[PDB]
Design a protein around this ligand. Structure first.
Ligand SMILES: [Hg+2]
Ligand SMILES: [Hg+2]
Length: 144
């Protein structure tokens, strides 16, 4: 049995990064990317509360900006929930959330890899480093 795996992609900036990044940051970014994994009919994501799920597109953020195909997985709903429980007791306790270094995209990337053997695109995972490499990022870092 094979089950489709999707990456739901949201621009937290609602198009503002694309417009304002050159003046704010000195560099062109296309979005402030938040992602989640949709598999077995639910949308899974990370945060300071730990691992959570909503119906797909049913978080506070609403419908995604893009739905990206990751691949297919043999992992059943029951095994996946055991896996997520393991993650949440170890590396994805809510306390470990860090906006730049251990975020919702860190989660989605490691879940994608477990389920399909693929990583998510670097342009999402590298965003925090792009921001930090700027006077803006360095000045607003401690606020964090
Ligand atoms: Hg929700
Ligand atoms: Hg994020």
């Amino acid at each position: 049995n094979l089950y489709p795996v999707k990456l739901y992609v949201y621009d937290l900036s609602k198009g503002l990064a694309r417009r304002l990044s050159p003046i704010m940051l000195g560099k062109q970014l296309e979005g402030i990317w938040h992602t989640s994994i949709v598999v077995h009919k639910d949308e899974f994501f990370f945060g300071s509360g730990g691992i959570s799920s909503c119906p797909p597109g049913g978080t506070l953020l609403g419908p995604p900006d893009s739905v990206v195909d990751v691949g297919s997985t043999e992992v059943t709903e029951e095994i996946f929930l055991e896996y997520l429980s393991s993650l949440g007791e170890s590396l994805f306790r809510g306390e470990a959330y860090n906006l730049f270094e251990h975020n919702c995209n860190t989660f989605s990337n490691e879940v994608a890899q477990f389920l399909t053997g693929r990583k998510i695109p670097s342009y999402i995972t590298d965003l925090p480093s792009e921001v930090l490499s700027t006077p803006f990022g360095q000045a607003l870092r401690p606020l964090l």
